[PDB]
Subunit: 113 residues, 4 copies
């Protein structure tokens, strides 16, 4: 709304709760990143209100998931210290859902609406 | 050996050929990434000779897949301009396989050996 | 409610619309599968009304997805003529989400709720 | 050769060893399945000798992975008592690799070679 996520712990068949997510946007002129917001997934593994419609401008975004910290808080290690999903937003009339299905040794993502 | 990849175009059920892959390593001390190697996947979607045993030391690595340029060359667009998989190497006795299963609107990876 | 699905065409980045889905349940003792409900996905790739809470008993269920016919209607072939996901329900106090993430040459599913 | 598989336990990031696999092929006049071969994956998670080149005719095949029995022999429960992958072979000149990425609550499959 207009950007949502869902973190899923597919090793346990439950949502990934309390994972830190940091949203960034690429600066159009330099190659650098602006932090837009930092969230934490709720018990349903979601992060409501990541961005407002007015600030969700077209461009290139990056969602960093703190997978290493998540798994560590469950007392286990992860192959990935963090996961960054980088994606292009051009059509701003649509909803964009960028989930993360995660184990300690795998991850997947897809574009949802 | 000891780091390998495999790009799979799961939209067409064929390997991802001619995709640029760049391997980086995080430098202990400075919080900077530095390029170790660049490669281009062959027809089987693999990139032999990414790194030698002597240089495959423990640390944090990142493999950047140019998914945007790959799909642009197939005359299609990608949700992801590029994919970076960041991973921790501590046990240097093992072989690490870091594949990319890719469509225009999704991707996934797992730790293989 | 209490069983749902979600079909996502990850090759095209859109919900899987108008896919026929059939829920079956295995009759304990006999080896007999029989139809519980036949449905079709709506515009958002979802299929409400799969089973009533009253009829949601512990047992083995199977959701059959007509992927071949789905792709055929899109003018493309599928590697899988249909997909059956078989699962065991023992805890009838929960909601079970059984999505299907589909391309022409791949699929995945996970337990959600 | 010409049909192969690879089972990966992505929950633990090791190969799916000692899993029972059953290959069937659909009888093209009745709508019923003929058992071709039953095998067990090796320590690498693979299962060589699934079918001979001679017996590899065009048709509909089905690979049943006994996931529930895999997990139980490991002291764990699986949401799926088994996984069957049904696929159409039309081009008999190609090799078909159909691996299974598995956890207790998720699985995915894709065409390779």
């Amino acid at each position: 709304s207009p950007l949502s996520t869902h973190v899923l712990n597919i090793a346990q068949g439950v949502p990934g709760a309390n994972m830190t997510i940091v949203l960034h946007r690429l600066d159009p002129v330099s190659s650098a990143w602006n932090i837009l917001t930092t969230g934490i997934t709720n018990d349903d593994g979601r992060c409501p209100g990541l961005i407002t419609k007015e600030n969700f401008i077209a461009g290139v975004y990056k969602m960093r998931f703190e997978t290493g910290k998540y798994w560590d808080a469950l007392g286990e290690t992860c192959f990935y210290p963090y996961v960054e999903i980088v994606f292009t937003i051009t059509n701003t009339s649509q909803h964009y859902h960028v989930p993360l299905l995660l184990s300690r040794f795998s991850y997947s993502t897809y574009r949802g609406s």
